Write a protein that binds this ligand. Structure first.
Ligand SMILES: [Mg+2]
Ligand SMILES: [Mg+2]
Ligand SMILES: [Mg+2]
Lengths: 175, 51, 52, 129, 187, 112
RNA sequence: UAGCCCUGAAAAUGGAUGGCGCUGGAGCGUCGGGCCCAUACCCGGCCGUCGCCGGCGUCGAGAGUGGACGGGAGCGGCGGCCCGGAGCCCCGCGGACGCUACGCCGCGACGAGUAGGAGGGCCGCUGCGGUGAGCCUUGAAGCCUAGGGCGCGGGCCCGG
RNA sequence: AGAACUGGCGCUGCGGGAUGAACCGAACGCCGGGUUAAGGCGCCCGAUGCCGACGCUCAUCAGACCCCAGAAAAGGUGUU
């Protein structure tokens, strides 16, 4: 999985072919993050084959729909669980962010594990993304944003170069 | 090979229903444009006649 | 069996008259069935932590 | 200029630069006539970028414009009075050259006959007094 | 340009005859008009016998011709062979068949006419039958040559039957070892 | 599948191809299809004498799908005008070489 | 525990992310929208090769995806005071081009190549049998030329 | 140095890897327009002169893109 662009939260359910030995297989369910619906129905059969004796030529899915959030404008504290490979071993990890939807957090996890632990987006396994409320957050970087009557200025503001007079007679001021 | 779908009467040389497929659907997207100016004005000049 | 066996069916539809397709095909792509979730809901799983 | 043939097309010739031989510039024991390079090392046969081009059949000019003179005719060299009269049914398409071995006395009648037959001679003003 | 297999794109068969025969060309120019204009296949067989080679136009002897026309159903058809007719002295009685061929030999075209036949050429065949209607085309034995009996597997392999080249057939010439069991081996 | 790229085409991307880039083999050559006459003389022995009767048999996989698809010359499409994505790895891996499962309709428009 | 960074980290001409340089990146990781260009691909031109062909119907009179007919019987529509019948034109005597059939035209697909194998040469040099009622002291051969051209090329023609 | 399966150089140019037999693209008639491939887009050098996104990183030996061109154990209250 490339995790190209913004991600997207898919739900996939799925079962295996009706056998003479057993009718009605239980039709399991996951929650896949993928940049479109094809990668969702290709990582679904990655996480299933690690957990059951189901492989994609011996089972079919019945539903792959985008499941999306119930409050896209309500700011939430997300706390997720990883299973990424490192070079030396692989590691269990808790992690928190702060965005407006779960697909805005798991996108921000792949951009974070890419930054800090050099894990590419293929070696990483989400266990479960759920929000927690405030004042149960362990991460102190997120925790300082949990204070009403918050104020901070914008120091040293710079952007939009070559936009004006690539050659000017007016010294920029940081402000 | 003059291009079909880009000039007319070459589609029609190869598909005669494709013309009456066309002027059956320009009618339902010109009459549906009138249905979205009249109904639009009947809710843009509606509350503009309230206050 | 499939050549001799048909012979009981090439001169069976001879007197009855179909287009019986005794020629065989490969496996067709699967037909659109209508799956069922009676009562319960699909069981949610998710991958497990790394412990040696 | 006055003799004015039939249709003259757009004469495009694909290349106007006259293929020369590899190592033409560097000696005079190698004249500019084309001979294709059949070495093992050399890079004109192996045909790298930015080197001496070599002829192949894609430079062949147009079948309706091959052998056309830029005046609009196709040349046909003659020697005397009688075989200028073989060209009387092509006075709008083919033109007559006069060979160098013709003298200046017999180049005087076959330039005056070529006006009574209205045939373009390329050199009407050649080896005159 | 996908297919490295380009080595077969040029079909190999003849388009013209390689000869300079100004009478054979007027028989191709007759029949290559009749090949593409008549809706038949006889005119596209006798056309393609027009080119090719003198190896592939074998001499049809006269007694195969009167053997392959005594059969049922060949009562009144013309014999057609692109190729020459020699006679046999082997056969005595000659029926009065109608033939048509390039180049019948002189001792054959008088043993044909005295029986009451008639030799034709391929100009008075086109004015006879353009379609080839009601004729029999025949062929000589093209693999009867002394060349085609040197040809096989190899003359020293198992079985072989190939007649190896010798300059003088006799004793002490290719009969010493390999050709019998008492010396060397039996091939 | 490291060399190809495929999905499930919809109706107008089975319609775009036959009209704009269809070409029929008559005996062995590819000629512009252009007139209903050039299908009916070749393949009315199976029952699809016009242009849009070919496109039934090729969109719904029909009884004469072999004789319709082997009639068409392969689609000599163009290079896409949006670029591609890495061309070698699978489309699941962020590339575009493999099964893409009806996303092919986004690609066929750029190829033509 | 693991990412970046540093210690660990020594070789001889002056030196190598290619150089210049780069630190709110012109460095590293995960990515987005653009953008630039191969002889690749698409469209079109042109040439060649290969394949399948087309015209001796030059027949303005040839029309053929059925024709003469013909006696035995009625359909309509043409020459009415209900009977219904050849025009071999001629007011025009008129009608382009073409097929070296070893030629001309059509459509389609392909085009790299040392060794090596075949085809074409109206490429070229020397000599003979033909043949141009060929060429010339009113200047042939030969050589030269910042002269005019043709052929993709071998080479060639003409001017001075 | 020697073998097995496939491909390539040998016979082969062209765009790329600064240059390069074999590497990644792609295999060649002569060209006009269009689009891409591997690649790249501060200046040499066609193209980021986008008001690019989120981080990591101070090196008195920075780092910088397959094969490919100089490195390990062990260690750091550097720092995440
Ligand atoms: Mg070499
Ligand atoms: Mg060398
Ligand atoms: Mg050679």
């Amino acid at each position: 999985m490339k995790a190209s662009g913004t991600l997207r939260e898919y739900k996939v359910v799925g079962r295996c072919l009706p056998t003479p030995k057993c009718h009605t297989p239980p039709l399991y369910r996951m929650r896949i993050f993928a940049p479109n619906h094809v990668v969702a129905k290709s990582r679904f059969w990655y996480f299933v084959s690690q957990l059951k004796k189901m492989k994609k030529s011996s089972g079919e899915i019945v539903y792959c729909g985008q499941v999306f959030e119930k409050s896209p404008l309500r700011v939430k504290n997300f706390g997720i669980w990883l299973r990424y490979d490192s070079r030396s071993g692989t590691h269990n990890m808790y992690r928190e962010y702060r965005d407006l939807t779960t697909a805005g957090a798991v996108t921000q996890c792949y951009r974070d594990m890419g930054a800090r632990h050099r894990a590419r987006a293929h070696s990483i396994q989400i266990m479960k993304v759920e929000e927690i409320a405030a004042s149960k957050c362990r991460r102190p970087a997120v925790k300082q944003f949990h204070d009403s009557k918050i104020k901070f200025p914008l120091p040293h503001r710079v952007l939009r170069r070559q936009h004006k007079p690539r050659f000017t007679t007016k010294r920029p001021n940081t402000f | 090979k003059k291009n079909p779908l880009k000039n007319l009467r070459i589609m029609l040389k190869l598909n005669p229903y494709a013309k009456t497929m066309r002027r059956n659907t320009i009618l339902r997207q010109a009459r549906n444009h009138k249905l979205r100016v009249d109904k639009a004005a009947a809710a843009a000049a509606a509350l503009q006649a309230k206050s | 069996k499939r050549v001799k066996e048909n012979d009981q069916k090439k001169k069976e539809a001879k007197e009855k008259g179909t287009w019986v397709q005794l020629k065989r095909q490969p496996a067709p792509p699967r037909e659109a069935h209508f799956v069922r979730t009676n009562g319960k809901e699909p069981e949610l799983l998710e991958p497990i932590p790394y412990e040696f | 200029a006055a003799l004015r043939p039939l249709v003259k097309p757009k004469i495009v010739k694909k290349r106007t630069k006259k293929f020369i031989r590899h190592q033409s510039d560097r000696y005079v024991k190698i004249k500019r006539n084309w001979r294709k390079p059949r070495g093992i090392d050399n890079r004109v046969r192996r045909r790298f970028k930015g080197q001496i081009l070599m002829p192949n059949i894609g430079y062949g000019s147009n079948k309706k414009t091959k052998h056309m003179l830029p005046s609009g005719f196709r040349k046909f060299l003659v020697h005397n009075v009688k075989e200028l009269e073989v060209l009387l049914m092509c006075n709008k398409s083919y033109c007559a050259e006069i060979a160098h071995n013709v003298s200046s006395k017999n180049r005087k009648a076959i330039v005056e006959r070529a006006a009574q037959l209205a045939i373009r001679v390329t050199n009407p003003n050649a080896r005159l007094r | 340009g996908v297919d490295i297999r380009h080595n077969k794109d040029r079909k190999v068969r003849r388009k013209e005859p390689k000869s300079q025969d100004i009478y054979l060309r007027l028989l191709v120019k007759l029949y290559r008009f009749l090949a593409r204009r008549t809706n038949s296949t006889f005119n596209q067989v006798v056309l393609k016998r027009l080119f090719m080679s003198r190896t592939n136009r074998p001499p049809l002897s006269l007694s195969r011709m009167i053997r392959k026309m005594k059969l049922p159903g060949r009562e009144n058809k013309t014999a057609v062979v692109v190729g020459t007719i020699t006679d046999d002295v082997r056969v005595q009685e000659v029926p009065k068949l109608k033939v048509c061929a390039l180049r019948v030999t002189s001792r054959a075209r008088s043993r044909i006419l005295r029986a009451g036949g008639k030799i034709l050429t391929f100009d008075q065949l086109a004015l006879d039958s353009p379609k080839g209607c009601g004729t029999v085309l025949l062929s000589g034995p093209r693999k009867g040559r002394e060349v085609y009996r040197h040809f096989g597997k190899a003359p020293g392999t198992p079985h072989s039957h190939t007649k190896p080249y010798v300059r003088s057939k006799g004793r002490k010439f290719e009969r010493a070892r390999g050709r019998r069991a008492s010396r060397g081996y039996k091939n | 599948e490291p060399y190809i790229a495929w999905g499930y085409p919809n109706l107008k991307s089975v319609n775009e191809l036959i009209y704009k880039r269809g070409y029929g083999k008559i005996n062995k050559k590819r000629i512009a299809l252009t007139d209903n006459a050039l299908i009916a003389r070749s393949l009315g022995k199976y029952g699809i004498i016009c242009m849009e009767d070919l496109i039934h048999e090729i969109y719904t996989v029909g009884k004469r799908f072999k004789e319709a698809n082997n009639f068409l010359w392969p689609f000599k499409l163009s290079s896409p005008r949006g670029g591609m994505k890495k061309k070698t790895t699978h489309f699941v891996e962020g590339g575009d070489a493999g099964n893409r499962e009806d996303q092919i309709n986004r690609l066929i428009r750029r190829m033509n």
